[PDB]
Design a protein around this ligand. Structure first.
Ligand SMILES: Nc1ncnc2c1ncn2[C@@H]1O[C@H](COP(=O)(O)OP(=O)(O)NP(=O)(O)O)[C@@H](O)[C@H]1O
Ligand SMILES: [Cl-]
Ligand SMILES: [Cl-]
Ligand SMILES: [Cl-]
Ligand SMILES: [Mg+2]
Length: 357
């Protein structure tokens, strides 16, 4: 319903945030080892702390089996290893979502995730108050010399925002009007950025699917957003990425265990409000990355500007209808090759051909 809280930008990043020595770089290096080579994004500089990972998708893979196309193109998630400090917030402001890593395994100076959640939670809210407060000063200083309604509106929000933060809540979970969000998105505020909780634990805990700290983390999250908790073992994953495909498959069978990195990649990608639509022929099958609540013309623009400027229609078929009926010819036969106009919001998984001029 409401507009999305986050920057109206193409190149979205997710940051690895957490207390020191909980698994941040060990998780990043697993991610890095699975990354796309930086030379394949020639328009971008990929710093050593940055990596981009293919978003795995079973629907995408099925479309590659069907068309057996010449070019298979995936979407990607950009993950940023950050660092806790002050210059910590430079790297943290430049991302659009947080992999909040939390330590849930015993050492071999204390072990507690919910305490670490509070430390970072509080530390995040405080530096947002610091941000809001300064613009609160700058606004009312300028309102002395101007009668601008926008200065008043921005001032009213900044007061309501600081109330929310002092009340012990994150800007992300406020009940904001559409126009408040517009102003909020200018501020790039830390607690406006979405979180995916990654509970790092032993390989034993992970495989057993039980952990002493998990119910205490889980119940806390329900009281603070209800965001996704993915339990994972950083050691197991490190171990598993270091071994080749069939050794991994033998290991996964014999230990009755499986990697959750794909789920982590998928969940992070969705959590920062990205989706994609497919295009699919023998030429290529490609995932077309877009923000949620994107209308069909703006989606078409992402391929070629003309597709938007002279937009006629988007010829869209759902994935479920293609896998069921076996081919596009067959989907057409059943009158399921729909035709959508300029106010059609694109669904994740839509397979689209655009008509224009
Ligand atoms: N599930 C686990 N079991 C055992 N050891 C682990 C597990 N997860 C992480 N570790 C170890 O704990 C350490 C965590 O450090 P690391 O992953 O480098 O975080 P970091 O990047 O140092 N965070 P920061 O200090 O903010 O830079 C590593 O040396 C890991 O080997
Ligand atoms: Cl850094
Ligand atoms: Cl440092
Ligand atoms: Cl097209
Ligand atoms: Mg690190």
């Amino acid at each position: 319903e409401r507009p999305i809280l986050g920057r109206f930008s193409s190149h979205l990043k997710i940051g690895i945030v957490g207390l020191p020595n909980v698994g941040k770089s060990t998780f990043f290096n697993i991610v890095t080892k699975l990354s796309i080579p930086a030379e394949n994004f020639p328009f971008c500089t990929i710093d050593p702390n940055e990596a981009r990972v293919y978003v795995p998708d079973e629907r995408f893979d099925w479309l590659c089996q069907l068309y057996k196309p010449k070019s298979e193109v995936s979407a990607y998630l950009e993950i940023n290893d950050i660092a806790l400090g002050n210059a910590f917030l430079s790297h943290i402001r430049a991302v659009d979502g947080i992999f909040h890593v939390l330590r849930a395994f015993e050492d071999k100076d204390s072990v507690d995730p919910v305490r670490d959640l509070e430390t970072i939670g509080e530390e995040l809210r405080l530096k947002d108050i610091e941000f809001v407060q300064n613009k609160i000063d700058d606004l009312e200083k300028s309102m002395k010399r101007s009668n601008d309604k926008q200065l008043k509106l921005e001032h009213e929000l900044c007061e309501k925002v600081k109330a929310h933060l002092e009340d012990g809540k994150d800007v992300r979970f406020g009940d904001w009007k559409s126009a408040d969000i517009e102003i909020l998105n200018t501020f790039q505020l830390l607690t406006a950025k979405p979180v995916v909780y990654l509970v790092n634990m032993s390989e034993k805990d992970y495989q057993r699917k039980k952990n002493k700290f998990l119910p205490k983390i889980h119940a806390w999250v329900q009281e603070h957003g209800g965001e996704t908790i993915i339990p994972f073992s950083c050691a197991f994953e490190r171990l598993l990425a270091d071994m080749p495909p069939d050794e991994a498959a033998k290991y996964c069978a014999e230990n009755q265990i499986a990697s959750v990195i794909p789920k982590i990649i998928k969940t992070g990608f969705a959590a920062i409000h990205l989706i994609y639509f497919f295009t699919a022929g023998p030429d290529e099958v490609k995932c077309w990355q877009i923000r949620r609540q994107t209308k069909a013309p703006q989606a078409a623009g992402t391929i070629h500007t003309d597709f938007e400027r002279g937009f006629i229609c988007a010829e869209v078929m759902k994935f479920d209808d293609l896998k069921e009926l076996g081919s596009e010819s067959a989907v057409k036969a059943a009158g399921k090759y729909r035709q959508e106009g300029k106010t059609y919001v694109v669904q994740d998984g839509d397979i689209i051909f655009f008509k224009f001029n």
